[PDB]
Amino acid sequence: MDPFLVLLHSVSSSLSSSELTELKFLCLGRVGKRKLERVQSGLDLFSMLLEQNDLEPGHTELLRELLASLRRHDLLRRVDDFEAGAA
Amino acid sequence: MDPFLVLLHSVSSSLSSSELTELKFLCLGRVGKRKLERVQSGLDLFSMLLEQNDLEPGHTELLRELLASLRRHDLLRRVDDFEAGAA
């Protein structure tokens, strides 16, 4: 079980439909419209960002910036715990 | 007809929308946000708690604690009658 994929699954399980709509707006210039139209969960968006090398196990700035815009400091703490054991 | 499922159906039929909102707040750390967003009746919440082994036919403490917070002692008596025949 890849620890990074279990972290991304937990973040996706703690988000609502309104929060997903805000994350799809902040990724307007990174992901195309036809692809963003197939996103119905955080896992869909996270998969596309990993394939484009926007999100990587050792590079998580984009994730931290998106969670700060949603004002979710509880989910930002889970990312910190990951980097502390993945150090 | 499983007696436990008929008990849970009666409790769900005796609750209002305000009471459901209070039960979804008390289960913030047990059930995730994306799942709690799909709860529109006590039956939705009860199904998720049974799958997580929080509620079982022979373990009903969590239910009794939630009904005591709603101050519903009439519904707590129905639980007692169940355990008396399921003894």
Place this chain on the structure above:
Amino acid sequence: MDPFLVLLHSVSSSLSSSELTELKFLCLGRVGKRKLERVQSGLDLFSMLLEQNDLEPGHTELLRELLASLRRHDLLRRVDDFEAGAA
């Protein structure tokens, strides 16, 4: 025209979406989740129960128990008229 199938069609036409959700909860231990996810009408559920021998033209106790939980005594009278001519 099988009289039993015309009875089950009339009962399905007299039920709402809220009532269907209550019937799918009371059949949690009889039908699996992947199959219950495809139920969008009483006819879907009734078909699965006939194939499992839970509902039969000469055995209707499960149906009578489900209608008593919905508190539908008008639909229970239609079942009685069936058994009186199917006697």
Place this chain on the structure above:
Amino acid sequence: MDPFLVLLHSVSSSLSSSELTELKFLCLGRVGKRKLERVQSGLDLFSMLLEQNDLEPGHTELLRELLASLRRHDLLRRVDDFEAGAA
């Protein structure tokens, strides 16, 4: 046009919101809370009582008892005229 349904519509059109609140209290043990929460007119309550066989074209005692508690003897006379032509 079913004469019984035209009678029940006239009784519902002659009642106020205070009178509806009194009728929902007198039906506390006959109808569940989640269902009574959706009642915004006499027609809503009458529909539920017909489905439970509490009110029938040939059995109107419960209706006559509820109207006597509201002290509405004018509406009780309309019920009498119905039974005199439905005799």
Place this chain on the structure above:
Amino acid sequence: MDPFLVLLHSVSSSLSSSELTELKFLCLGRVGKRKLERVQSGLDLFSMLLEQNDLEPGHTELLRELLASLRRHDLLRRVDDFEAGAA
């Protein structure tokens, strides 16, 4: 443009949500519950009544009886003008 369908569209445009609820109660024994649950406008109800032959261009008694219960004598005059040119 079928004159009967333009008449039914005008009647539907002159009714409120309270009036629609009263018309769905008076049609309890003519239309089933699962179908009446999909009615959100007079046009939905009128379509079902035409398919059951309850409403026809040359038979409008049921319509006139429903409008007399809503006490809408202005809309009953529009029906009269129709039969006078459809004579």
Place this chain on the structure above:
Amino acid sequence: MDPFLVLLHSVSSSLSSSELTELKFLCLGRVGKRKLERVQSGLDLFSMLLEQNDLEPGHTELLRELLASLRRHDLLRRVDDFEAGAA
């Protein structure tokens, strides 16, 4: 152009997906499951019933019984006009 096949095509063009699902339930004991799984229009079902001699140009009782269960008296009138010229 066989008049019977033009009648069956008109009936199939006047039915919805919900109505087709009800007709496939009423034919549970006449047609097998593997075959009923390939039915996506009234024409598919009608073809199978003609090959089994359930529907014939001079025997239309099964059709009239299925349309009476859907409460489609407008489509039952089209069948009557057929038998009046096919007399």
Place this chain on the structure above:
Amino acid sequence: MDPFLVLLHSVSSSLSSSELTELKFLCLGRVGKRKLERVQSGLDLFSMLLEQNDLEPGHTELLRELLASLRRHDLLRRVDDFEAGAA
């Protein structure tokens, strides 16, 4: 770019879901139910009417009659400008 098809696209872009439901009711006797069930935009309905020769670049009476029933005199002006250059 066929001017008639650009006109029909503009009219479809200026209509709501309530207005589409009213247009599908006024076309009950022109288009069958199975086909009307696939209409999710004015463009779907307009395509079917062109194939049946109900709407043509040189015959627009049916369109003008449907827009007058929706009471859309702004969209009726766009049709006039078309016939003035297509004269």
Place this chain on the structure above:
Amino acid sequence: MDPFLVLLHSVSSSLSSSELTELKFLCLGRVGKRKLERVQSGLDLFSMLLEQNDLEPGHTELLRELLASLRRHDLLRRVDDFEAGAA
């Protein structure tokens, strides 16, 4: 920014709920009941009147007549300033 739409927004922001009720009564024969039931601001009513060609940037008599009935001569002066620059 269309100057006419900024004028109509200012007039809507200077009206109360009592004034809106008076304007919906004076438009009884111009707008249908089902549509007037969705009006909760002057902007809702103004949008419907523009689509029916009752209000236009170069025809404002109906607006001036409605404001004279509310006895609002301050808002009638704002309309005058508009026509003086839109001359």
Place this chain on the structure above:
Amino acid sequence: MDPFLVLLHSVSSSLSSSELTELKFLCLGRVGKRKLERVQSGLDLFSMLLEQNDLEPGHTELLRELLASLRRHDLLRRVDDFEAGAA
């Protein structure tokens, strides 16, 4: 280039899979099942009808009857233009 074969190719290019299924049902008694099972385009069906002398350059009634059942009056106009030059 035989003009009749160019007409039949144009009609086949203007039809959908749903329309082809309706044409194969209307030809149930003219073409056998094993042969109708190989039809994947209008050209397949047209070839079989020409070999059976059902369709001929100087006899097009069957074609006109099939297009009238599909309610395709645009394609019926193309047949008329053919007979006007093949006169």
Place this chain on the structure above:
Amino acid sequence: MDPFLVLLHSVSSSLSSSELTELKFLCLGRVGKRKLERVQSGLDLFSMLLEQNDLEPGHTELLRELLASLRRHDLLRRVDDFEAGAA
């Protein structure tokens, strides 16, 4: 049952609508307007503050400051009892 969530539920059950309006004003710079518009109980506001890390089981200063502004010293005593057992 998380003791912190039972404390927050008791505080929410001891507040009125006027008190909630005062708490939403004191949180103007902490929570956005679109989110504060969905607050209809103390539980709604408390959930948002927990997700932003403003309220935590081991950090309750913001809560104590809000209750001191409402001048509710009875509810401040309940917070003290919590920290005394959660010590």
Place this chain on the structure above:
Amino acid sequence: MDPFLVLLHSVSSSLSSSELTELKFLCLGRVGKRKLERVQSGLDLFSMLLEQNDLEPGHTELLRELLASLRRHDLLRRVDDFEAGAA
């Protein structure tokens, strides 16, 4: 993280449903009705305006004009800070 998209997200989070209704009225002639019917947040409207080149990172007049009509001078200051760093 595109600074322009973070600005537009903050403006959308500081607006109410009444304010959104006013912005959809002021954009009546810029965006069609069928598209404006899908707008449930400022982000929906902003996305459509960016695709039509009405709003651009280096052209923000339309935004400043809409915020001046809502009389939101606090949100107009946030736009100024953006242009000062995007200079």
Place this chain on the structure above:
Amino acid sequence: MDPFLVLLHSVSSSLSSSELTELKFLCLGRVGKRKLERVQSGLDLFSMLLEQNDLEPGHTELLRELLASLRRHDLLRRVDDFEAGAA
């Protein structure tokens, strides 16, 4: 806890309904009628004035002028103490 918001809450708690009516008259040309109709406390009015930049933590002249018209020199002293610590 923003000190400015605690000051405005104290001023609102020291005012009566007669005083609020006088403050809504003195703000006739600053706030529109439809918005002033929703003001039921000083906090409602203060929120609107902050969004219009009429009241700011470093600009309090409008507040001091309104309190001098109510002849409330006790509340003007509380404003002075604020500016002395916010210096």
Place this chain on the structure above:
Amino acid sequence: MDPFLVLLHSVSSSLSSSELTELKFLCLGRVGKRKLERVQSGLDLFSMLLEQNDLEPGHTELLRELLASLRRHDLLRRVDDFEAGAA
């Protein structure tokens, strides 16, 4: 890598399913129905238009006209940049 084919791929990746349906309606008289039924992406439609010589690297009017009907001025700018380097 043909620059024209990379441009057409980018335009197809920036379109939704609703936009594709509008483009298939505007190409009703250019492409046949049986072929338009196989279009599930802009790339499918673009391939057919290139083979018919409707779209060419040195003739892009039809593309510019279709994008102006979708009101996509952002995608029209990408076409301009192409012709500026393909000059």
Place this chain on the structure above:
Amino acid sequence: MDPFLVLLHSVSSSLSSSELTELKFLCLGRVGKRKLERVQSGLDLFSMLLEQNDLEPGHTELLRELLASLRRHDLLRRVDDFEAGAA
């Protein structure tokens, strides 16, 4: 009947489409994209994992880890009963 294959069939029958999507995300680095695109049931995924030696009758850690992420402790009990008889 291999007991391990009957266990895996029961687990697949107790899962929904949302749960399957979560399991396909957690297996991103174990199974390729072209193969994961053919997974429409738990049985499809389980077959691929058995062929790669990720799941074996005597090694079930990966299964237990995936069920713990779905928070399905009821299905984890069925795995325990298997190892107790397969001991």
Place this chain on the structure above:
Amino acid sequence: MDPFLVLLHSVSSSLSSSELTELKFLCLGRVGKRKLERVQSGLDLFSMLLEQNDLEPGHTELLRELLASLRRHDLLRRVDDFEAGAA
């Protein structure tokens, strides 16, 4: 085992059917239609490109350009690792 052929097999196993359709469009002028019609996997397309000398172990520009259009930077990293050991 030729290292180049193992690289091309891994890239083909990491692509979906939508991605294959995009790659067949970008190779419209390099491969003929009759041959492109037989492509059902990346391996089919790669074989044809090797035979035409478009792809070679020491020339991989075309591959890198196609993967950049699919925006697959993860698969472009695998190509880099190949050239680093094949140096």
